């Protein structure tokens, strides 16, 4: 009583019901380094301007 599969049926993406636990870290990755402090705030005018040699602004 075997029915031969039609065209395009064996290439379908199917789902599998399994009790095998999903691997938490299949890549065996380490801990990612801490990103930079990403400082935030409100801009203020430069203290005494450019402070480049004799320029006052």
């Amino acid at each position: 009583g075997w029915v031969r599969p039609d065209l395009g049926e064996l290439s379908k993406v199917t789902k599998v019901k399994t009790d095998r636990p999903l691997p938490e870290n299949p890549y065996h990755s380490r801990a990612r380094p801490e990103p930079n402090p990403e400082a935030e705030g409100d801009l203020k005018p430069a203290k005494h301007g450019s402070r480049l040699f004799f320029w006052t602004m």
Binding site: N36, P37, A39, K47, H48, R51
Partner: protein, 70 residues
């Protein structure tokens, strides 16, 4: 008469010089502090400055790759 019609009082110059000295001292300390901050940021790289670009991780394709072991 000359002092009245041509020149201001002694305090004027005194306090103007005090303000000028204060401003220049702040500028000098800020210059040293900026140089030290530049050195530290270039040496360590944790600061906002001297941030050299790396590969963007959004370019990575996370999908099955026709082989189970990538």
């Amino acid at each position: 008469w000359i002092a009245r019609t041509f020149y201001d009082g002694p305090e004027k110059n005194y306090e103007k010089t005090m303000a000028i000295l204060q401003i220049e001292a702040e500028k000098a300390e800020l210059r040293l502090k900026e140089l030290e901050v530049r050195r530290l940021m270039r040496a360590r790289g944790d600061g906002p400055w001297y941030q050299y670009p790396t590969i963007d991780k959004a370019l990575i394709d996370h999908s099955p790759k026709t082989t189970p072991d990538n």
